[PDB]
Design a binder for these strands. Sequence first.
RNA 1: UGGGAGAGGGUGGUGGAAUUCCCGGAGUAGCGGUGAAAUGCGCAGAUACCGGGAGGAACGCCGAUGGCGAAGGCAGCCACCUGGUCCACCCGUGACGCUGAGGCGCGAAAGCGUGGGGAGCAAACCGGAUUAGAUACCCGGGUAGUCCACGCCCUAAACGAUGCGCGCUAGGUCUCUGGGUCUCCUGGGGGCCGAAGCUAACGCGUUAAGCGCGCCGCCUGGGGAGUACGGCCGCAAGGC
Lengths: 88, 101, 73, 119
Amino acid sequence: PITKEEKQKVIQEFARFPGDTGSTEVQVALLTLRINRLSEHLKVHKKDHHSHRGLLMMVGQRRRLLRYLQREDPERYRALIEKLGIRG
Amino acid sequence: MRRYEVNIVLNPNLDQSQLALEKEIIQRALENYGARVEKVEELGLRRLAYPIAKDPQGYFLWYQVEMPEDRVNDLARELRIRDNVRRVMVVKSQEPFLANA
Amino acid sequence: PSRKAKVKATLGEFDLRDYRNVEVLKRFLSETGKILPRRRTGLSGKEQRILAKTIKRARILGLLPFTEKLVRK
Amino acid sequence: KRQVASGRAYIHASYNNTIVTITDPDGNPITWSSGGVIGYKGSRKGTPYAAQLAALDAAKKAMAYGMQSVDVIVRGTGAGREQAIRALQASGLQVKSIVDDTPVPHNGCRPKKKFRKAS
RNA sequence: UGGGAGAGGGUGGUGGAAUUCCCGGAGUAGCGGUGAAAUGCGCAGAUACCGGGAGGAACGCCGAUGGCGAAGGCAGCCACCUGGUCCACCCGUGACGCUGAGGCGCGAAAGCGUGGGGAGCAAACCGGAUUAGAUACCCGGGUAGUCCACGCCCUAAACGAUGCGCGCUAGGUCUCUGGGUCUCCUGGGGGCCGAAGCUAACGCGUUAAGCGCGCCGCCUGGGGAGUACGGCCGCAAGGC
Ligand SMILES: [K+]
Ligand SMILES: [K+]
Ligand SMILES: [K+]
Ligand SMILES: [Mg+2]
Ligand SMILES: [Mg+2]
Ligand SMILES: [Mg+2]
Ligand SMILES: [Mg+2]
Ligand SMILES: [Mg+2]
Ligand SMILES: [Mg+2]
Ligand SMILES: [Mg+2]
Ligand SMILES: [Mg+2]
Ligand SMILES: [Mg+2]
Ligand SMILES: [Mg+2]
Ligand SMILES: [Mg+2]
Ligand SMILES: [Mg+2]
Ligand SMILES: [Mg+2]
Ligand SMILES: [Mg+2]
Ligand SMILES: [Mg+2]
Ligand SMILES: [Mg+2]
Ligand SMILES: [Mg+2]
Ligand SMILES: [Mg+2]
Ligand SMILES: [Mg+2]
Ligand SMILES: [Mg+2]
Ligand SMILES: [Mg+2]
Ligand SMILES: [Mg+2]
Ligand SMILES: [Mg+2]
Ligand SMILES: [Mg+2]
Ligand SMILES: [Mg+2]
Ligand SMILES: [Mg+2]
Ligand SMILES: [Mg+2]
Ligand SMILES: [Mg+2]
Ligand SMILES: [Mg+2]
Ligand SMILES: [Mg+2]
Ligand SMILES: [Mg+2]
Ligand SMILES: [Mg+2]
Ligand SMILES: [Mg+2]
Ligand SMILES: [Mg+2]
Ligand SMILES: [Mg+2]
Ligand SMILES: [Mg+2]
Ligand SMILES: [Mg+2]
Ligand SMILES: [Mg+2]
Ligand SMILES: [Mg+2]
Ligand SMILES: [Mg+2]
Ligand SMILES: [Mg+2]
Ligand SMILES: [Mg+2]
Ligand SMILES: [Mg+2]
């Protein structure tokens, strides 16, 4: 699972400023953490389709936010990505 | 790590030696698997509600511990390898949900 | 009718999650290993649901029975 | 012939027959009867009277072996169960106790169609 | 951020009840089955009873009128891995939203392929009865299959036969699950009865079939026909 600390880590590592918890980057970073974990969970347990639907929603929610960034601040977008190493 | 509660029922016909030789490997395996023993109880002999292993009784053990979850299954898998060990029930600890209180 | 008394009212402060206290747990099984119904246990949807879990655990351990013989008929 | 005195009486009631078996204090049969053992050959075996008779045949044949007191154990739910019990009680044998031990699965094997349609 | 309930999903373990078979004991003439019977099983000793073992499949009571899931669906118990979701605080972002042709994935049962496994059940099938006949209903047997692993198939009365989202419009009553200053208020579900209103009626009624806006799907008398042709998909059966 994802431990509170494990989580608090990314939140710091990505927050635009102190106390920032709801940024597009923070959210995209958190989703990216969950996604990757679940993706690992599914490399094994390939028959766990109910959980795969959760993966599908996450990935969707992500592209959606990222889409917003690209449209709002083309830079932060390129930076958020390069940093996370998303897409590819 | 997480807090568990190992339950072990073993042959009720063991001389002080055999009983200690089992508790030996029990205590051992635990250590070998990160079983930090917070507490313990040994109500020993008790009248089973039904015969387990043809025997109308069993000798009980109990250990409140903390260990690497990913090994809780292996730990218990191990405890079972014994012949004198007739039951192994590990359980994630829980706040006592009182009632009628 | 189901009015002999509810097993809950007949008890004191007890932990529903204690799968070893066969002393009280046993008072929740019928004249057979059968788990008593809420109409008789006096417990609630949630309490009753935890009892079951606990009882079954005690049954696996050997502390409680799965079934008993009726004595009459 | 072996002298046993006290033992067990097993009533296997069903919708087609009643078969009684008397055994020593630890399960080994001494004698037995059933609607077929006595006269009745087909449908009649199920009837309670047949049960009554078989029950008596069982006890009688058992007293020869020196039986006196029995511990009854009922299995089955047939049209004739309760009669075999009243039969043994008036048979002479002393009914020390009665216990229903009809087996019931905790849901194991798919029943015959005849016993399904049961939600 | 802090908490909660849950047969939500995947994996590995493990428990007891019962059935069948095998071994031992004891015991003897029938058992079984039906409306009644017979086929069948039993002196190579069955049925009924006790003890031991093997194996597969399912999970009694608790279960509800209950819970969870997008649907299909999901009930011993334990551990791990994992999805969704509800509540409180009012903390962060700042319209980032809704719907959704096509695409992609999931999709009960039966069925297919390869390899396993088979207790019980059981299409076909082999017999016994019934009957005017009885290619049925009832009875004795019984193969595929039902179970597992991998691939396929993609259908259903897949139903609430009610597409998704949001806003608005009395209340009473029961219930599940949170929070509260725990008469009872609050939030999210599950039922029932009902204001206004709607409806051909039946009924629906804050879980709309009411009053509205957004987007998708679909209908246009019955038969021919979900057929023919064509295309796509499928090993096939067949599907669209
Ligand atoms: K014969
Ligand atoms: K009307
Ligand atoms: K065609
Ligand atoms: Mg008969
Ligand atoms: Mg579950
Ligand atoms: Mg068995
Ligand atoms: Mg034998
Ligand atoms: Mg046969
Ligand atoms: Mg013969
Ligand atoms: Mg013959
Ligand atoms: Mg002979
Ligand atoms: Mg046996
Ligand atoms: Mg076998
Ligand atoms: Mg639901
Ligand atoms: Mg359904
Ligand atoms: Mg969860
Ligand atoms: Mg704020
Ligand atoms: Mg601002
Ligand atoms: Mg959509
Ligand atoms: Mg769009
Ligand atoms: Mg399917
Ligand atoms: Mg299938
Ligand atoms: Mg197959
Ligand atoms: Mg096969
Ligand atoms: Mg059959
Ligand atoms: Mg006719
Ligand atoms: Mg004929
Ligand atoms: Mg048949
Ligand atoms: Mg329906
Ligand atoms: Mg209501
Ligand atoms: Mg409500
Ligand atoms: Mg409510
Ligand atoms: Mg009106
Ligand atoms: Mg009308
Ligand atoms: Mg009218
Ligand atoms: Mg109404
Ligand atoms: Mg509406
Ligand atoms: Mg309408
Ligand atoms: Mg639509
Ligand atoms: Mg159409
Ligand atoms: Mg036409
Ligand atoms: Mg047509
Ligand atoms: Mg068709
Ligand atoms: Mg083709
Ligand atoms: Mg082709
Ligand atoms: Mg077809």
